[PDB]
Symmetry: C3
């Protein structure tokens, strides 16, 4: 059993949703209206915090439609399993047009990626490949 726990930080926050049965990504919603000028960026608040399942992290990924239509990209950051702050998404507007975001819009996806917490060891030489 694995569960992503979600806390609403404000009453009208939208709990992230999985869009299809085997959607890799969980949709993240903006809690505010916002404007991104051409070739600038904006830090978008989702209104939620999360507790990621053990030995995973949450990767922020772009929505394809916003990339295609509007030139929006998202930093591929990292929501750690121990992070308890609000999820906030940095959107880069790589177009020549102002981007208008609305409260309640889907603006990114969170993917629950399996990772290794391997220890790190310094050595004088690596093996050959």
């Amino acid at each position: 059993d694995e569960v992503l726990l979600v806390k609403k930080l404000v009453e009208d926050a939208i709990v992230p949703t999985r869009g299809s049965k085997c959607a890799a990504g969980i949709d993240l919603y903006s809690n505010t209206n916002f404007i991104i000028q051409p070739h600038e960026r904006f830090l978008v608040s989702t209104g939620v915090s999360v507790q990621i399942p053990h030995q995973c992290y949450g990767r922020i990924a772009p929505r394809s439609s916003l990339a295609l239509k509007y030139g929006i990209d998202v930093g591929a950051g990292v929501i750690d399993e121990d992070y308890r702050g609000e999820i906030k998404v940095i959107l880069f507007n790589h177009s020549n047009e102002i981007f208008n975001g609305r409260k309640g819009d889907r603006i990114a996806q969170l993917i629950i990626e399996r990772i290794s917490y391997c220890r790190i060891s310094e050595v004088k030489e690596l093996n050959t490949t």
Copy 2:
């Protein structure tokens, strides 16, 4: 046993290839010639669809050489295990020069990432870290 199934949507599509024994990424090939103006973007067609193995997704990743030499980046999107459409890659040209892409060029990589389909649960408080 895990297998990535690939359907050619056009007869001259190139089946994606794994480049070295433990290459994380599978090379994606353009099915068309294309031009990307400076500081603009272009949606590149690969000519294939795929069926990703269970409990994985396909992440689109940039080729390092195109980033280094030409300032190309790729959105880090998400090919879901249930997606049966053509794989199309959004390339951002963050340089001051026109980028000329050719049919048959390697233009991105697909990485088959392990993920969790955890359910999502709203709670009033998360644990402390």
Copy 3:
């Protein structure tokens, strides 16, 4: 047991570090001072090579603070388990300001992602979803 092995390629390289107990990412440090002009990019040397654990790869991810404050993004490239070259990070400066990087600065994160080395098979049709 999984271990990330790290070789210093120069004596003053900094071994990458995991920042919190369940930090997804391992901090990568610059081995040089560098300057990135507005809306340009720079390939930053870390001074280390690595041996990633089996059935994983190292994904280069952006540091959130540099994205927020300075408009820095990183290509989400791929350090293969068989790669024995120096880790070098492509930083894109999507702001209007010069970015000044210093030797010893944390400039990206490496995430040890679990992946599939599935074989690739061409077929005439995929299943329906």
